[PDB]
Amino acid sequence: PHRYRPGTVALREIRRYQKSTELLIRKLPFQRLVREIAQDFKTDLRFQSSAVMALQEACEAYLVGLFEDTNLCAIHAKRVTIMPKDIQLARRIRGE
Amino acid sequence: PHRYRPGTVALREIRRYQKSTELLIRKLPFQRLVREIAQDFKTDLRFQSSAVMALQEACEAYLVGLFEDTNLCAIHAKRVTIMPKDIQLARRIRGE
Amino acid sequence: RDNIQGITKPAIRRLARRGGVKRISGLIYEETRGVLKVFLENVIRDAVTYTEHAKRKTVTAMDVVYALKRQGRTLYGFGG
Amino acid sequence: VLRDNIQGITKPAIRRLARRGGVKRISGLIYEETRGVLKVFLENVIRDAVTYTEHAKRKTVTAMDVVYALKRQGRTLYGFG
Amino acid sequence: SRKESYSIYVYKVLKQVHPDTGISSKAMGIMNSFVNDIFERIAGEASRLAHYNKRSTITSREIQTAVRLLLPGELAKHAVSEGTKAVTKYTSA
Amino acid sequence: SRKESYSIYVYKVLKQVHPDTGISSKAMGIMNSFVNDIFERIAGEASRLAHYNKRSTITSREIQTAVRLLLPGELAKHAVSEGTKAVTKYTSA
DNA sequence: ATCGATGTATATATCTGACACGTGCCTGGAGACTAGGGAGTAATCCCCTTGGCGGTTAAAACGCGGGGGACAGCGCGTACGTGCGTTTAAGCGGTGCTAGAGCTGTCTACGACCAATTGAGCGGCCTCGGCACCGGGATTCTG
DNA sequence: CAGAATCCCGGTGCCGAGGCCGCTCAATTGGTCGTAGACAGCTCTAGCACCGCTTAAACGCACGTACGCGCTGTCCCCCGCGTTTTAACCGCCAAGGGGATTACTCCCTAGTCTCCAGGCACGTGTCAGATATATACATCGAT
């Protein structure tokens, strides 16, 4: 059967997800995680349907931006694979 | 004659200048530069004696911080010589 | 609890793909989970503080908008 | 008018600043990049300082105008009142 | 209760720039938030500028200076002309 | 005419913590600017909290929440503890 | 297996003006009374958020063929640092003037506040077509 | 040069955008008058200019070896493909905890005249810190 060489599909996916607009995190797992973390500060809290969506949009934007910055640091070392030290360097330089 | 090996004087200067607190740029050449640039916006400007000092302190602290940041991204490439691309990369990641 | 495991590997891959990353090392996942957890913790602490000041029991979208606004990032589309 | 004074930021001063930052070895091209960066930095601060000066209808630039200009960018400087 | 918004004004402007084009509800909510954002930034800077001069009244000079300080060069260059023309026509009426 | 600064109160505290040390005018300038900075940050945050809830007055509840938001966890706990202690002594005076 | 040429630190006595303090004085915090509207209370309405039953699938988890990337070695030449003599002009100390920051002093143009008025705005119901989802087809580009 | 994957022509049908109607309370015109800041006049701070003596710093230089960069080498951490099996998806129905609004009322702050003392400048002096000379000994270097 026909088989694509390594990386052809990665580029196709890159184009697909750069052209799309939908959310990428599963709604239920995120909602359960939010309800779990909030329990340490105050018990029996309640959340409106739009608050979880606002938190999801902010978190997704933050991670996308951090990955964009990490990609520059990876190319600078003449590597292609991103590694934890690259994230650590980007975060240190950003002053987080 | 007598002659030290490469780098020992550099290290001695590093240990010296991190202990001291004086200014490193000449006061008068800098005052001329400040009166040079300000004239492009308005003529006959005057500067209080302390304003030039405030600008010099801000500029020196800024260059020192930029070089400190540049050094981290320089070591990451397994090099010891800093080069222009390190400054350009640091400024790009800082978002300015 | 195990709820942190709900952010499966494919979701992280999709996020990395949107950022243009072509090849990803297998250790990036635990670091990404650690980075996300502290961000969520930071935002929720502020949101819950605003909720508690109002004597409410339900957390509204305005409290999240103000938390993000204080951290220095502004969100458009949910209110305010 | 001064046709050119930015040449007055000498190579030794730049080396000393890199030394305070812990830089051990410096490439020969760093000097012109550093001059360009410093000039770009100074223009942005001076434009605001002059803007406050003109708004106040004064003719003398004052330390406080620089303090407020620096504050707007988030670089509050302590020591000059 | 009744909630105020600029939605009708945003629609009138859109109909003047593109009579055949329409706008969805999400875009109306975004524009309605963006307007309040810029409003708070300009009013904030005008407030700081008033105290440093010991003045008790905000005037058009404070707005003009705040606009020149916040917006980049070309945008400020056009906006200042728009405001000057508007105030001149209003006073002439 | 007569200016106003915190140099006296800073000196009283200095002589209470370390009765044998003095302070240069250069250090006094930094201590004077530090107080104006934190004062402005807290009053700003308290005003925003009061406006969002549609309240006309600023009370200790606003100050306590602002303190819990601006200061880190360890500084906030002690500051709030002694703030409430002081308020209790004042109200009981 | 080592030792001596260099540089740092530290120990002591002298000078001189920065900071602590004492005298002076004036403007702004405390005492005391008053008015009212802002805040704090319970009751009520009512809507929406918390949970389960059902079921059928979009998506995650499991193996592995095998690749092109990350990592190291030796090799080597030229960019940069170190050591020196010449000479520039900043630094410092002093003299003269005045642009212009700053302040007191005069008064009227501008605004806040009350009241009656009314139409531009928001609340809800209606409707119909750009959009959306589907199928079957033509065309692309990688290999 | 085969063909998996892609882009999109064309049909049905829907529910959201546009549009209308209802009716209220935010915005308008008019009058009153108390005072913030626009303005003139006057003062004297410190900023601008000018000169000569000194030598720390700067330039321009010689030069040699440490670092930046390059190929040859490799071995395995992952990309892409398929099967299992799942728990996430929609969809329909529960129901009372909590938010939103109303009317009551009391205690809290703002606002005012009175008045007297805390802390804002001026003056003074003395000893803390800046300075010059000598040397213990560590470190770096070639053999």
Side-chain angles (χ1 to χ4, degrees):
Chain A
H2 188 77
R3 177 179 285 260
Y4 290 105
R5 282 173 55 75
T8 296
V9 183
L11 289 170
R12 193 157 65 213
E13 291 184 326
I14 290 164
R15 291 174 183 149
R16 188 183 298 159
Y17 295 115
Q18 283 186 349
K19 192 158 56 60
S20 88
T21 294
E22 69 292 336
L23 292 173
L24 302 173
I25 300 168
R26 291 289 135 179
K27 296 180 181 178
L28 262 59
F30 183 84
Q31 179 170 142
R32 295 194 297 251
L33 178 63
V34 169
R35 283 193 157 101
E36 183 197 295
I37 289 170
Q39 186 173 356
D40 293 349
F41 308 130
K42 196 179 186 68
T43 194
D44 301 340
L45 280 174
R46 298 168 89 86
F47 285 84
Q48 289 208 292
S49 200
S50 57
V52 180
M53 295 298 127
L55 292 170
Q56 185 164 356
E57 277 275 31
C59 295
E60 293 193 21
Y62 173 73
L63 290 175
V64 171
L66 185 64
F67 281 116
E68 290 185 335
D69 284 346
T70 299
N71 187 241
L72 301 180
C73 296
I75 290 163
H76 183 67
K78 311 193 232 313
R79 289 191 322 264
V80 174
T81 314
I82 60 161
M83 300 182 72
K85 59 186 176 184
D86 304 328
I87 296 175
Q88 295 169 8
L89 179 64
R91 294 195 79 218
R92 164 57 191 73
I93 293 172
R94 286 159 63 107
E96 295 191 14
Chain B
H2 178 283
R3 171 177 274 265
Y4 284 109
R5 296 276 295 289
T8 196
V9 187
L11 284 165
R12 194 162 66 213
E13 288 181 341
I14 293 168
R15 293 181 183 122
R16 187 185 293 184
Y17 296 116
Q18 290 190 342
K19 186 182 284 151
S20 93
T21 67
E22 78 283 6
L23 291 172
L24 302 173
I25 298 164
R26 291 289 129 179
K27 296 187 175 74
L28 184 57
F30 186 85
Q31 178 166 342
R32 291 195 291 253
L33 176 59
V34 173
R35 295 187 193 231
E36 181 201 301
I37 295 179
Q39 190 154 357
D40 287 350
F41 311 127
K42 200 177 188 68
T43 55
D44 306 343
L45 284 174
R46 293 186 172 229
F47 286 81
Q48 285 192 329
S49 51
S50 56
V52 182
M53 296 289 100
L55 288 169
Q56 188 169 351
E57 274 276 35
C59 296
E60 293 192 24
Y62 174 77
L63 288 172
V64 171
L66 180 64
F67 284 121
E68 277 177 9
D69 273 2
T70 298
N71 186 234
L72 297 178
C73 55
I75 293 169
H76 178 77
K78 304 180 66 177
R79 287 185 282 114
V80 298
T81 310
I82 66 160
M83 289 179 194
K85 52 176 173 276
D86 304 324
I87 297 176
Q88 296 175 8
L89 179 65
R91 292 187 77 222
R92 162 58 194 75
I93 294 173
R94 286 162 58 112
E96 77 197 351
Chain C
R1 305 179 182 186
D2 204 44
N3 297 296
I4 190 62
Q5 305 302 135
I7 310 301
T8 70
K9 164 178 176 182
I12 294 168
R13 292 179 73 94
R14 291 188 293 258
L15 287 164
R17 290 302 195 222
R18 188 171 275 169
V21 180
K22 197 170 73 168
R23 199 173 188 273
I24 304 171
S25 176
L27 296 115
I28 291 289
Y29 310 116
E30 293 292 281
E31 191 76 342
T32 302
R33 287 173 181 137
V35 170
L36 176 61
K37 191 169 183 287
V38 299
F39 181 84
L40 279 173
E41 285 174 10
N42 289 330
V43 178
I44 296 168
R45 192 192 299 114
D46 284 13
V48 175
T49 302
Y50 282 111
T51 309
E52 266 201 328
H53 176 261
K55 306 196 207 61
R56 291 202 285 287
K57 293 183 178 74
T58 196
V59 179
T60 70
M62 294 306 279
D63 302 338
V64 177
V65 170
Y66 297 151
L68 292 171
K69 186 47 181 315
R70 241 185 47 88
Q71 265 83 50
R73 52 184 63 251
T74 301
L75 179 68
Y76 284 180
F78 291 89
Chain D
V1 64
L2 297 183
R3 281 297 204 232
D4 179 7
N5 186 87
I6 187 61
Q7 297 299 117
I9 304 302
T10 70
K11 163 174 175 182
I14 293 170
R15 292 174 77 96
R16 291 192 288 264
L17 288 163
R19 294 309 190 213
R20 184 168 277 162
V23 182
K24 191 178 181 185
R25 184 175 160 112
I26 303 166
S27 182
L29 303 180
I30 289 289
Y31 311 111
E32 200 61 17
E33 187 79 341
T34 302
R35 288 184 186 118
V37 174
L38 172 61
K39 190 174 180 178
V40 170
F41 182 82
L42 273 155
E43 286 177 8
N44 292 333
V45 179
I46 295 165
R47 194 191 301 113
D48 285 13
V50 174
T51 302
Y52 287 106
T53 311
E54 285 198 302
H55 176 256
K57 300 181 292 182
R58 288 183 323 219
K59 288 193 202 60
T60 301
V61 185
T62 292
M64 293 306 296
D65 306 341
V66 181
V67 170
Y68 298 153
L70 289 169
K71 181 175 192 168
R72 144 167 290 282
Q73 299 185 8
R75 296 189 174 282
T76 306
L77 180 65
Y78 283 2
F80 296 90
Chain E
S1 56
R2 317 171 72 117
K3 285 76 169 184
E4 322 181 318
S5 71
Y6 292 102
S7 60
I8 64 178
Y9 311 111
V10 178
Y11 203 87
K12 290 180 170 143
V13 176
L14 181 59
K15 291 293 101 177
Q16 282 186 209
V17 172
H18 291 122
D20 62 7
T21 297
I23 189 163
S24 58
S25 181
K26 303 301 182 179
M28 190 64 55
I30 289 158
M31 299 294 307
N32 195 66
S33 305
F34 167 82
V35 176
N36 286 272
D37 184 338
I38 290 184
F39 175 87
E40 291 275 22
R41 284 154 81 164
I42 296 170
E45 190 66 17
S47 181
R48 295 183 190 113
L49 287 168
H51 287 86
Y52 299 161
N53 286 50
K54 313 204 175 50
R55 296 272 187 284
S56 284
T57 191
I58 287 172
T59 72
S60 58
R61 301 214 313 132
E62 274 69 76
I63 309 301
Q64 185 174 150
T65 304
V67 169
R68 290 200 260 266
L69 288 170
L70 290 163
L71 304 185
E74 193 67 14
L75 292 176
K77 191 182 297 291
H78 292 293
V80 169
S81 77
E82 297 298 333
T84 304
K85 191 182 301 293
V87 171
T88 286
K89 186 192 291 215
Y90 172 81
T91 185
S92 80
Chain F
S1 59
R2 290 168 153 211
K3 308 307 187 299
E4 233 166 308
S5 71
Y6 297 104
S7 65
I8 299 180
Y9 312 109
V10 175
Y11 209 83
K12 285 196 173 107
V13 173
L14 178 58
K15 297 303 187 182
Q16 285 188 332
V17 176
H18 287 147
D20 50 12
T21 297
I23 185 165
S24 177
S25 54
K26 300 300 296 185
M28 183 64 84
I30 290 157
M31 290 296 296
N32 194 74
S33 60
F34 170 75
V35 180
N36 280 276
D37 184 359
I38 289 187
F39 177 106
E40 198 277 332
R41 298 185 201 190
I42 296 170
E45 191 69 8
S47 76
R48 279 191 277 290
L49 289 170
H51 265 279
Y52 298 166
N53 287 259
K54 307 190 213 318
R55 295 298 189 103
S56 74
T57 188
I58 300 198
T59 75
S60 57
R61 286 179 58 83
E62 283 64 63
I63 307 301
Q64 178 156 296
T65 306
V67 166
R68 283 180 173 311
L69 289 169
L70 296 168
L71 298 189
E74 297 298 331
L75 295 176
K77 291 168 62 71
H78 288 76
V80 166
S81 74
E82 67 181 83
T84 63
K85 188 172 65 178
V87 174
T88 302
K89 189 162 160 66
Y90 182 75
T91 292
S92 59

